[PDB]
Amino acid sequence: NINDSKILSLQNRKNTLVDTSGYNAEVSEEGDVQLNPIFPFDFKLGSSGEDRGKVIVTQNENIVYNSMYESFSISFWIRINKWVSNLPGYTIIDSVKNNSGWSIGIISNFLVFTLKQNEDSEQSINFSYDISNNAPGYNKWFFVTVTNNMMGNMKIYINGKLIDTIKVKELTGINFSKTITFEINKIPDTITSDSDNINMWIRDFYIFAKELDGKDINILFNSLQYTNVVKDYWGNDLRYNKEYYMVNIDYLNRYMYANSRQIVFNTRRNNNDFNEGYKIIIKRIRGNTNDTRVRGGDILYFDMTINNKAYNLFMKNETMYADNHSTEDIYAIGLREQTKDINDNIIFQIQPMNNTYYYASQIFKSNFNGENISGICSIGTYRFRLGGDWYRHNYLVPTVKQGNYASLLESTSTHWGFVPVS
Structure with missing residues (x-):
């Protein structure tokens, strides 16, 4: 009943990235994109610059139109190479065609989700990791999940846990993009130094046509995870x-x-x-x-x-x-x-x-x-x-x-x- 609302399922089938959701969104990986042969079959991008890896999903505009303006959910497993607490701005997952859509980036110790209606208006929500207990960086995997309901709240969960919640404002005129571009990109400076390279790992990126609630979210959370194998x-x-x-x-x-x-x-x-x-x-x-x-x-x-x-x-x-x-x-x-x-x-x-x-x-x-x-x-x-x-x-x-x-x-x-x- 839950997967009934899934409209995008970016996964590693062969040694190829594809949309297993059934809507056959086009997936094209460019540059240095590393896929993992062994579970969780995560792919890996970086901020190298040489031939920076860049995966691009182009969904069926029509299915985007009939899903994104009401309620929806985005979930996935992510990991940042060396997510220190000073880290500069970086867009990691981007779905903004012109000046509208949604975007996901990392800044200092934040992971922020953004809804952009126009160049002069946005609405972000974020997750901030506890620096106190993370001196060497937050370099561990975590399951994200963003839910959005235009007629209600916008929230984000990290590992089945609600982190932030907020009321969506009249974002009239917002235009969702059918293109989602995975790629690490440094935001326009103000920090002003060239820091080390950061890698990003992604696994099971999904999007649903409805606002999943905590319960189904944690059901999903375990759905793909070997709860019994101890992790490092x-x-x-x-x-x-x-x-x-x-x-x-x-x-x-x-x-x-x-x-x-x-x-x-x-x-x-x-x-x-x-x-x-x-x-x-x-x-x-x-x-x-x-x-x-x-x-x-x-x-x-x-x-x-x-x-x-x-x-x-x-x-x-x-x-x-x-x-x-x-x-x-x-x-x-x-x-x-x-x-x-x-x-x-x-x-x-x-x-x-x-x-x-x-x-x-x-x-x-x-x-x-x-x-x-x-x-x-x-x-x-x-x-x-x-x-x-x-x-x-x-x-x-x-x-x-x-x-x-x-x-x-x-x-x-x-x-x-x-x-x-x-």
Whole structure:
């Protein structure tokens, strides 16, 4: 019943971009347009300038006429290379023939949708990402969805969530264009420097002849998404035998290091970047053998190579010490030496855990067959006598709460992210 209103479905069929909606809108890609052979089969443009990629959809004017002036919806998956917070103006999706139609661009940390009736009048709505928790840029995938009702409201959703809403004003004389041009284009200066190249990834761009509501929007949101495959910090599939930078949503201003075989979290210097720290590799024990992708319920361990040696993360047995609260069933996570024999001591089960504005997961301590989960992974500061320390000192370190860890499932402190190493 929902797809009954779909009038454009730009997708990657062969290794070609086409309109699978049935209205056969013409699709023509120019310059450097990279298509992805593997899911989500996203295509990729850039602000290179050389032969800047430019995809152009030309819909059946008649179907545009009978759909766009009433109510409609635009949705799609998008991603920006290095969406920093200073970024200059850029038009990314444009459907303005003369001085009328609609347009979608990015500015500082904003993604704005615009309805343009004339050169002297517009009406925009936008999404602004939380800079606080996004120092290295908002470089993750997100599902957008814009809804418009001339006789009511114009709104935009990011990942099934309503972000902004507004009443449409008398935009009489507005002229929708049948042409939609995908291409990164810098807006007319005022910033006045030549910044780095940004890439943009697009997937499943759709347009509906009606104003979809939250429910159908989130239905759509999951409709095309492997909710159960865990994703890495940017939204791509999580993989095994791949180097990652494991972080804790509660402390992104920290990186992983280790002391006397004990994993500690230090403050990163390159705040506007995710380098530093020690890396991790996820090793599978039980999961879909045909993949190297991490799925919920999959059993695994983690390898951390330091000097040149590879260690296994593992749950300690020593009792903890902390200035404030108690040691419920708290065990620190440290590094042991690979025993070439899977120690129950290093076994965990991963679970996808995505939030409106980030991609994380939950790691649980389990046995080999995972029919017994004893606790969950967390983080906190505790008293230690590490390398050279004669006196105990506080260290923020990974931990595993056992006993009844049910009380922590709702804590972002158990939310772990994996930033791949570029």
